[PDB]
């Protein structure tokens, strides 16, 4: 059968760069646009859903997953690598919940999910993961929005974008984001900043939104999103 390779494929170059992570960040920038907006009582994670016919069933997959009763993910980049990280996160959360009988804080979960992605830039015979996770959560009275990169780093944001045209979207957000928003825009303003990078007509089954308030994270039903898409809500 086999043994497995033992030698890292991420290597330093004469520059002082880890070329493999530099490239895996370019895969990230091919992926579907995703925005994140911390409100002042909730977090909004919205994402441009993928499809390219009318044959696909736009309710058999989800780009907005729940990790815990109080956590969420969306991603930008390779779809297979996302189901691997969503599944190592859900287990991390369950070891944490099995030892402290307490839902894993959101600072914690991002710091561990990141160390799995860090393990694949220094392990034998693997390539880094091809995604950026945007992790929302609402613990201890506050909301949180993080973002881990295939590098392994992670940064807390007050609002950000990833994926395609994430330089146009970080600018658009830089102006339109004035703290003390209500939870309901971040939705509105989020959906707007997907539109600054999306060509076509948005519908209830074409984007996916997830909120995350004190009551716990929840994906928004198709009906619910159709209403925010009055482009006035």
């Amino acid at each position: 059968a086999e043994r497995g390779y033992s030698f890292s494929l991420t290597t330093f170059s004469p520059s002082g760069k880890l070329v493999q992570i530099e490239y895996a960040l370019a895969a990230v920038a091919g992926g579907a646009p995703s925005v994140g907006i911390k409100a002042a009582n909730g977090v909004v994670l919205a994402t441009e859903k993928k499809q390219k016919s009318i044959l696909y069933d736009e309710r058999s997959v989800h780009k907005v997953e729940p990790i815990t009763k109080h956590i969420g993910l969306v991603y930008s980049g390779m779809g297979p690598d996302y189901r691997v990280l969503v599944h190592r996160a859900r287990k991390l959360a369950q070891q944490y919940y099995l030892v402290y009988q307490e839902p894993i804080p959101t600072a914690q979960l991002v710091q561990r999910v990141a160390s799995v992605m860090q393990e694949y830039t220094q392990s034998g015979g693997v390539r880094p993961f091809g995604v950026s996770l945007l992790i929302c959560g609402w613990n201890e009275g506050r909301p949180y929005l993080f973002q881990s990169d295939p590098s392994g780093a992670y940064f807390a944001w007050k609002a950000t974008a990833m994926g395609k045209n994430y330089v146009n979207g970080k600018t658009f957000l830089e102006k339109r984001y004035n703290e003390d928003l209500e939870l309901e825009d971040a939705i509105h303003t989020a959906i707007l900043t997907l539109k600054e990078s999306f060509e076509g007509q948005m519908t209830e089954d074409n984007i996916e939104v997830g909120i995350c308030n004190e009551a716990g994270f929840r994906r928004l039903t198709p009906t619910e999103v159709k209403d925010y898409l009055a482009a006035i809500a």
């Binding site: 390779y5 690598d81 189901r83 599944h87 694949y120």
Partner: peptide
């Protein structure tokens, strides 16, 4: 799907 994904991620 997930068994296939491993064959993607390793070089072996």
């Amino acid at each position: 799907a997930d068994i296939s994904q491993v064959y993607t991620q390793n070089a072996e």
